[PDB]
Amino acid sequence: DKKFHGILDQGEGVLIIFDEPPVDKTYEAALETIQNMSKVVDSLYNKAKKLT
Amino acid sequence: PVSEQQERAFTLGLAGLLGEGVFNFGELLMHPVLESLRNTDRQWLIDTLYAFNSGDVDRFQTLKSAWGQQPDLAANEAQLLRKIQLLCLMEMTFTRPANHRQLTFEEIAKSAKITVNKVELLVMKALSVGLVRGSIDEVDKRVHMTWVQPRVLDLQQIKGMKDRLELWCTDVKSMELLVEHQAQDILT
Amino acid sequence: DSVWFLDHDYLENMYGMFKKVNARERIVGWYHTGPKLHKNDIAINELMKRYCPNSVLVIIDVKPKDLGLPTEAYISVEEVHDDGTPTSKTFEHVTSEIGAEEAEEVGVEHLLRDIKDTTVGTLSQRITNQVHGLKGLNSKLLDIRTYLEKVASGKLPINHHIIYQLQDVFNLLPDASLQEFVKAFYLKTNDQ
Amino acid sequence: LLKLFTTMELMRWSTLVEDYGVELRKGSSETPATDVFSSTEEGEKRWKDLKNRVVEHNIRIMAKYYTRITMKRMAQLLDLSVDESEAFLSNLVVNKTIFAKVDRLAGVINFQRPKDPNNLLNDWSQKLNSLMSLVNKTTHLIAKEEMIHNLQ
Amino acid sequence: VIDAFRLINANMMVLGHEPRQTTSNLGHLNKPSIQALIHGLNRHYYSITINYRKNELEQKMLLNLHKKSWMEGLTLQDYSEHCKHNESVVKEMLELAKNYNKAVEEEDKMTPEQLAIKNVGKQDPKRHLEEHVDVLMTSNIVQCLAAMLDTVVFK
Known part of the structure; x- marks a missing residue:
């Protein structure tokens, strides 16, 4: 449900709670830029067909 | 008077050891007063200054007959042990360049010649007062000094500063050339 | 330099007159014109205070002492210095900035089209500025080094401010790592 | 009584109970308007409540100085048991006066914000901004300082 | 005058x-x-x-040569601040990206600006996108150059 944002470890018999990690931000900005470029590439090819 | 300088000079050193403020042991030696004119009391007095700076329990301990003579040293024996420990720690951070101002607890204990356990408490009291700043990572067992105070004024200590300044002069020259190099076609 | 000429009365006359040309021009103090700060300057500093409301001593040189401004600002200070030396009268520096009023700004901006510290107009403009900070830093290192030796040999007075300032650079500890940036551009350039 | 309380230097509970006990606990006085310390009827409970307070002060001081401390090492310091120290920390953390991370396995207590490699880089960036201001200032003091050779 | x-x-x-x-x-x-x-x-x-x-x-x-003016060039800005900015900048491009997908489909005649307005996207959607990366790239690029240099020099 992620109603406390931890993970339960049944192999050891401990509850670990997820600490703050280093930035996800870096990956996310790259991810967003690459998806927009993929839409564009599809448009870019069609007009190009005219050349060859 | 001759006799007056001798009395005031004795109390001045005693005060100096008690100090939490004192980081000018190097200045006391440098001043002509103590060195030039010695008496039997004054022979020990300069030695105790020396023992602090070095910050070894072995040098310090031989002088112990002195601890009994004044009640001032005898009474605040805890502050003395803490002081010599802390000063040795500062000298090591200082000797070492800007690569590490990190020293282990083990290394601090060796210099101090006081047990590892008591060193850990002593270092904490110095932090608490604010003489020194840093962090203690007891997983690693290092005290990483963020900040260090103005050190003892001796000649050698003037020389320690030169080492880093000189090194810095050569790394900057090298580097300055790399910054000019990149797109030299366009600065306009 | 213990023989020089100065007209003290002139300082007083000038004060009243400058007020008519602009209200922002009153006797602030005196200017020195380099090359160093001398003992001989101290005699005039004393005198200036009486004439002026309390004065400032600004040293405006013809060529920078660093790479930036050619001006230093000073205030007379008395401080105890110990190494075998007594209490010294010295001049303690305070840092300076640049700044102007609207009239001044108008003429300099139209006239300027020079290269500057940076203008800003490209990425490449920015590197010129980076070159200039690093070169500046080289300059300061030389002055301090030659002085450290002079302190050791002569037993020149040890000013607490200098020993403390240099110490701090060393203690902070450099650490630097992970850095990245985008790469969106290719589709756009390709697009043109 | 004032001196121990005022320093943020280490204290140990036990030393205090005896030290204060001789001098302070007695609370002789002539006025009827105060005789309270531990001499009075609520005074007894007030001394019981003091155990909790001292130990909590130890936690605050250690939070700043230390970044990481071993569990074993913190219980000695506080003057608490292994279970008690781990337990006392959670109550404090939720109540919000110190922030620790408690391993109920006696592993480690982290008074730090959650470590990132990223975090450390930023702290250096600020130091760097300060470091440059200091170097520009210093050069000036050098020029006046070089002139003189009559004051040595 | x-x-x-x-x-x-x-x-x-x-x-x-x-x-x-x-x-x-x-x-x-x-x-x-x-x-x-x-x-x-x-x-x-x-x-x-x-x-x-x-x-x-x-x-x-x-x-007006000025001492802090050149010093800033070296002065390192926060790592989190670059990451944060990188993410913010991407968010401006997203807006422009809808207009930009439509503009690119047909640009088969002459003058990019006319094509771009015609197949939706006021002036140049490409330009807007490019300016947005350039400012972020500029601050991140100089700070990285500066950071690696300072750490080695001071140490």
Whole structure:
């Protein structure tokens, strides 16, 4: 449900709670830029067909 | 008077050891007063200054007959042990360049010649007062000094500063050339 | 330099007159014109205070002492210095900035089209500025080094401010790592 | 009584109970308007409540100085048991006066914000901004300082 | 709106001092306001030239070399602040990206700006996108160059 944002470890018999990690931000900005470029590439090819 | 300088000079050193403020042991030696004119009391007095700076329990301990003579040293024996420990720690951070101002607890204990356990408490009291700043990572067992105070004024200590300044002069020259190099076609 | 000429009365006359040309021009103090700060300057500093409301001593040189401004600002200070030396009268520096009023700004901006510290107009403009900070830093290192030796040999007075300032650079500890940036551009350039 | 309380230097509970006990606990006085310390009827409970307070002060001081401390090492310091120290920390953390991370396995207590490699880089960036201001200032003091050779 | 002028008296006009002024220089007449130019010319003055000479030392002082001004170039900005900015900048491109997908489908004639407006996207959607990365790239690129350099130098 992620109603406390931890993970339960049944192999050891401990509850670990997820600490703050280093930035996800870096990956996310790259991810967003690459998806927009993929839409564009599809448009870019069609007009190009005219050349060859 | 001759006799007056001798009395005031004795109390001045005693005060100096008690100090939490004192980081000018190097200045006391440098001043002509103590060195030039010695008496039997004054022979020990300069030695105790020396023992602090070095910050070894072995040098310090031989002088112990002195601890009994004044009640001032005898009474605040805890502050003395803490002081010599802390000063040795500062000298090591200082000797070492800007690569590490990190020293282990083990290394601090060796210099101090006081047990590892008591060193850990002593270092904490110095932090608490604010003489020194840093962090203690007891997983690693290092005290990483963020900040260090103005050190003892001796000649050698003037020389320690030169080492880093000189090194810095050569790394900057090298580097300055790399910054000019990149797109030299366009600065306009 | 213990023989020089100065007209003290002139300082007083000038004060009243400058007020008519602009209200922002009153006797602030005196200017020195380099090359160093001398003992001989101290005699005039004393005198200036009486004439002026309390004065400032600004040293405006013809060529920078660093790479930036050619001006230093000073205030007379008395401080105890110990190494075998007594209490010294010295001049303690305070840092300076640049700044102007609207009239001044108008003429300099139209006239300027020079290269500057940076203008800003490209990425490449920015590197010129980076070159200039690093070169500046080289300059300061030389002055301090030659002085450290002079302190050791002569037993020149040890000013607490200098020993403390240099110490701090060393203690902070450099650490630097992970850095990245985008790469969106290719589709756009390709697009043109 | 004032001196121990005022320093943020280490204290140990036990030393205090005896030290204060001789001098302070007695609370002789002539006025009827105060005789309270531990001499009075609520005074007894007030001394019981003091155990909790001292130990909590130890936690605050250690939070700043230390970044990481071993569990074993913190219980000695506080003057608490292994279970008690781990337990006392959670109550404090939720109540919000110190922030620790408690391993109920006696592993480690982290008074730090959650470590990132990223975090450390930023702290250096600020130091760097300060470091440059200091170097520009210093050069000036050098020029006046070089002139003189009559004051040595 | 700075002119150098010379007085016209009854005596000056009879002599013909007014053409005499234009001679020996590049010649200069004023401009601001219509009423002020006709009136001024007849009664008030004749106009003549101002040109400017300022030496290289004057230019050096004019420029305002400044110590912190160059120092900033080296001064490292937060790592989290670059990451945060990188993410913010991407969010402007997203907006532009809808207009940009439509613009790119047909751009099969001449003039990119006309094509881009025609198949939806005011002025140049490509341009907007590019400016947005450039500012972020500029701050991140210089700080990385500076950071690696300082750490090694100081250490």
